Write an enzyme that holds these catalytic residues in place. Structure first.
Site, short mmCIF file in Angstrom:
data_model
loop_
_atom_site.label_atom_id
_atom_site.label_comp_id
_atom_site.label_asym_id
_atom_site.label_seq_id
_atom_site.Cartn_x
_atom_site.Cartn_y
_atom_site.Cartn_z
N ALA A 52 -8.53 38.65 5.86
CA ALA A 52 -8.24 37.26 6.06
C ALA A 52 -9.44 36.46 5.55
CB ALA A 52 -7.95 36.97 7.52
N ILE A 53 -9.36 36.13 4.28
CA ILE A 53 -10.44 35.50 3.52
C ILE A 53 -10.06 34.05 3.27
CG2 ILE A 53 -11.65 35.60 1.26
CD1 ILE A 53 -12.12 37.97 3.08
N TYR A 56 -6.75 32.13 4.62
CA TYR A 56 -5.90 33.20 5.22
C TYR A 56 -6.26 33.53 6.63
CZ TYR A 56 -3.36 33.85 0.83
OH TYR A 56 -2.58 33.65 -0.28
N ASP A 130 -0.84 43.08 4.40
CA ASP A 130 -1.14 41.63 4.22
C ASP A 130 -1.11 40.87 5.52
OD1 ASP A 130 -1.33 42.12 1.40
OD2 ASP A 130 0.47 41.02 1.02
N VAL A 131 -1.95 39.83 5.60
CA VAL A 131 -2.09 39.06 6.84
C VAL A 131 -1.08 37.93 7.00
CG1 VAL A 131 -3.80 37.34 6.01
CG2 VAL A 131 -3.84 38.11 8.40
N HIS A 152 9.35 47.68 -2.25
CA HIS A 152 9.23 46.26 -2.52
C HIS A 152 10.62 45.66 -2.34
CE1 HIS A 152 8.48 42.49 -4.65
NE2 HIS A 152 7.25 42.83 -5.00
N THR A 164 8.38 46.18 -12.48
CA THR A 164 7.20 45.58 -13.10
C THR A 164 5.95 46.45 -12.99
OG1 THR A 164 6.83 44.28 -11.08
CG2 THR A 164 8.08 43.28 -12.85
N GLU A 222 -1.55 46.56 -6.82
CA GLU A 222 -0.19 47.06 -6.71
C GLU A 222 0.22 47.91 -7.89
OE1 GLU A 222 3.77 44.43 -6.94
OE2 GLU A 222 3.09 44.83 -4.87
N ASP A 245 11.38 39.17 3.24
CA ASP A 245 11.26 37.71 3.27
C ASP A 245 12.63 37.09 3.44
OD1 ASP A 245 11.09 34.99 2.67
OD2 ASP A 245 9.59 35.43 1.09
#
Ligand code: UDP
Ligand code: UDP
Ligand code: GAL
Ligand code: GAL
Lengths: 264, 264
Positions: A52-53, A56, A130-131, A152, A164, A222, A245
């Site tokens: 968490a930068i 984030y 991920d956060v 994914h 991809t 990734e 999502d």
């Protein structure tokens, strides 16, 4: 518990095992009571790493709160929050047997692989996410195994030529057009400490080679994660229940639960 | 190889994973090219144990001949023939990387568990089968895992109350009427050397306890094997393709291959 019956599959709508005999984890494939006992017998500790930068840090409160509700409840958990703002980490009340360490930074594959000795002594498995996400439903010991990746959510119905992957053979992450099992997302992977350290060390080594040769893979870590999991196949694969999502993709019938989702 | 597709299951007619996320091995679930590479990368050696006592020596020629055709071809194999008649063991020509040892005897769980140090140095996995059988089709590294049992061909469609588990609570092999995943047959089990030694040592210890208490489980070591695999769940389960009798059961559509069968 219900007797499994060999001539009545639980799920007939989805692939539940990979061609290398790794389970693909869907609701309906596992009896969590069985799995919880197996893991509690070993006194399993699970590490969960999150970066968490900058901005984030704002995602941490909801991430932690909802991890407390849904992530490995009943088991020992050690959260590792890597941040450039230690004072901004919210104080979230934790359940028994759960702890949080704040690791000040001042990238991810490197950072995960030089915290090496600390993870080996403290946890049995590591989970790297991920956060900017929230837990909405059960994410437990069903995921645990030497090495796992996650499908994914945008590509689970796609053919491989559409994945991809990195397509330039100048990159360490290069995968030919006719190779490939799945397209894994970088946002949710893990395994045993030994396997995660192997993976992140490989990805880091491969990124440095590309950097020295003046090339960045198309999707950064990734891309390397996908090349690694092609050559070292995961021992479990998580279904898109584990990385979704709802805003972009809805709630299809094939997803009986939405367990860990992007924040709107 | 064909790309697996997450929304097209390979087999929809059969359960391919147990509720504890162990693969159930059926034709159509595995890509053997992938598995062979994984195992050859580790230079895997597989031990195959067979007892041929008294009249049962007569079954060895066909057993060995057909193992050479179908059993772990391409991999290192060490056959262990336990017999009371070493001179009666037929000389069968073996493929490269394959060897046979004759172990003179003068029961099975004991004998398997005091050959302990020899197996640990010589092989990576052990497979324990009956001798009055033949290989008719591929039996390879798809079966290999820390611990596996095999679905008894007479009981794979049955409910648990019908399983002929040991029902007397006076026996170490006792399993209550409302417990039980599957009914495994004693004729085909295996795993890593460490897991097979654990299992056979447990079964032997449990048999001795029953013998000291004046009781024999209803199906002898198969009863104990079933109690063990209830409490220590197998990491793969083999389908009845791996243990069949065409004379008694025919060739149902659900069995795409008959790999290892009783001799008429
Ligand atoms: O400024 C940043 C960018 C990324 N991340 C971490 O790395 C992930 C990637 O975020 P995303 O890729 O969605 O943002 P972007 O990659 O476009 O900056 C985030 O979840 C965080 O977990 C972070 O902490 N700060
Ligand atoms: O006299 C015997 C009985 C059994 N066996 C071994 O143990 C297995 C069990 O055979 P089965 O139970 O079908 O015969 P039974 O148990 O009725 O004697 C055989 O496959 C052999 O592998 C043997 O070698 N000699
Ligand atoms: O093509 C791969 C990309 O897919 C996008 O949907 C995703 O947001 C990116 O993070 C990346 O994974
Ligand atoms: O009920 C268990 C029994 O089933 C029989 O069909 C079999 O031949 C026996 O060996 C034993 O396994």
């Amino acid at each position: 518990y219900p007797q499994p019956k060999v001539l009545t599959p639980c799920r007939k709508d989805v692939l539940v095992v990979t061609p290398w005999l790794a389970p693909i984890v869907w609701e309906g494939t596992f009896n969590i009571d069985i799995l919880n006992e197996q893991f509690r017998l070993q006194n399993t500790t699970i590490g969960l790493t999150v970066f968490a930068i900058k901005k984030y840090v704002a995602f941490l409160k909801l991430f932690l709160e909802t991890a407390e509700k849904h992530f490995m409840v009943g088991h020992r958990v050690h959260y590792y929050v890597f941040t450039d703002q230690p004072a901004a980490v919210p104080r979230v009340t934790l359940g028994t047997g759960r702890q949080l360490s704040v690791l000040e930074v001042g990238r991810r594959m490197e950072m995960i692989s030089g915290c090496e000795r600390r993870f080996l002594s403290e946890v049995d498995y590591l989970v790297c996410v991920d956060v900017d996400m929230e837990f909405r439903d059960h994410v437990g010991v069903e995921i645990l195994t030497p090495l796992f990746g996650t499908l994914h959510p945008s590509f689970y119905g796609s053919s491989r030529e559409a994945f991809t992957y990195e397509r330039r053979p100048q990159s360490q992450a290069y995968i030919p057009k006719d190779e490939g099992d799945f397209y894994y997302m970088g946002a949710f992977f893990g395994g045993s400490v030994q396997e995660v350290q192997r993976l992140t060390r490989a990805c880091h080594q491969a990124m440095m080679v590309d950097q020295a040769n003046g090339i960045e893979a198309v999707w950064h870590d990734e891309s390397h994660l996908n090349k690694y999991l092609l050559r070292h196949k995961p021992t479990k694969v998580l279904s898109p229940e584990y990385l979704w999502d709802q805003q972009l993709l809805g709630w299809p019938a094939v997803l009986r639960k939405l367990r860990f989702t992007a924040v709107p």
